[PDB]
């Protein structure tokens, strides 16, 4: 942009945390959360692991599924999804927090996606493939 900071690739999580919203009403088959695992190099199947009270499924693609809404009531539920690349002998850890995010702010600056899919819908793209019609 116009500041100059770093330029090295960072495979793994960005040392941050993700937040998934749940009905907190004991509803099972809850939505699926997706972590932003930074990719790089070529081919790197790593191992994943979950640790949430309810039922969760970490997919090698970097997606931990949220199932069962327990406890999720008097407080919030939080767990850590561990990652480990056997190729680069590296490992990462991202904290996902299941909590209610009743935010009214409707003006995203540089981070529209936020594992919420609540405000600012995402279904308005007619263009699907490449059509040649610029002329004639």
Curated annotation (Swiss-Prot):
Traits of the deletion mutant: Embryonic lethality.
Post-translational modification: Cleaved by MMP24. Ectodomain cleavage leads to the generation of a soluble 90 kDa N-terminal soluble fragment and a 45 kDa membrane-bound C-terminal fragment 1 (CTF1), which is further cleaved by gamma-secretase into a 35 kDa. Cleavage in neural stem cells by MMP24 affects CDH2-mediated anchorage of neural stem cells to ependymocytes in the adult subependymal zone, leading to modulate neural stem cell quiescence.
Chain positions listed as propeptide in the UniProt record: 3-136
Tissues expressing the protein: Expressed in cardiac muscle (at protein level).
Localization annotation: Cell membrane; Cell membrane, Sarcolemma; Cell junction; Cell junction, Adherens junction
Protein role: Calcium-dependent cell adhesion protein; preferentially mediates homotypic cell-cell adhesion by dimerization with a CDH2 chain from another cell. Cadherins may thus contribute to the sorting of heterogeneous cell types. Acts as a regulator of neural stem cells quiescence by mediating anchorage of neural stem cells to ependymocytes in the adult subependymal zone: upon cleavage by MMP24, CDH2-mediated anchorage is affected, leading to modulate neural stem cell quiescence.
Domain notes per entry: Three calcium ions are usually bound at the interface of each cadherin domain and rigidify the connections, imparting a strong curvature to the full-length ectodomain. Calcium-binding sites are occupied sequentially in the order of site 3, then site 2 and site 1.
Oligomer status and interactors: Homodimer (via extracellular region). Can also form heterodimers with other cadherins (via extracellular region). Dimerization occurs in trans, i.e. with a cadherin chain from another cell. Interacts with CDCP1. Interacts with PCDH8; this complex may also include TAOK2. The interaction with PCDH8 may lead to internalization through TAOK2/p38 MAPK pathway. Identified in a complex containing FGFR4, NCAM1, CDH2, PLCG1, FRS2, SRC, SHC1, GAP43 and CTTN. May interact with OBSCN (via protein kinase domain 2). Interacts with FBXO45.
Protein name: Cadherin-2
Taxonomic lineage: Eukaryota, Metazoa, Chordata, Craniata, Vertebrata
Segment of the intact protein contained: 24 to 159 of 906
């Amino acid at each position: 942009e116009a500041s100059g900071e770093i330029a090295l690739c960072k495979t793994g999580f960005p040392e941050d945390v993700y937040s998934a919203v749940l009905p907190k009403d004991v509803h099972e088959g809850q939505p699926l959360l997706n972590v932003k695992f930074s990719n790089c190099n070529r081919k790197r199947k790593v191992q994943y692991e979950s640790s949430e009270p309810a039922d969760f499924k970490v997919d090698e693609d970097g997606t931990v599924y949220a199932v069962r809404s327990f406890p999720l009531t008097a407080e919030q539920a939080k767990f850590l999804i561990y990652a480990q690349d056997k190729e680069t002998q590296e490992k990462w850890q991202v904290a996902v927090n299941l909590s209610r995010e009743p935010t009214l702010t409707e003006e995203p600056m540089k981070e529209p996606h936020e594992i919420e899919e609540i405000v600012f819908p995402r279904q308005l793209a007619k263009h699907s493939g490449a059509l040649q019609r610029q002329k004639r």
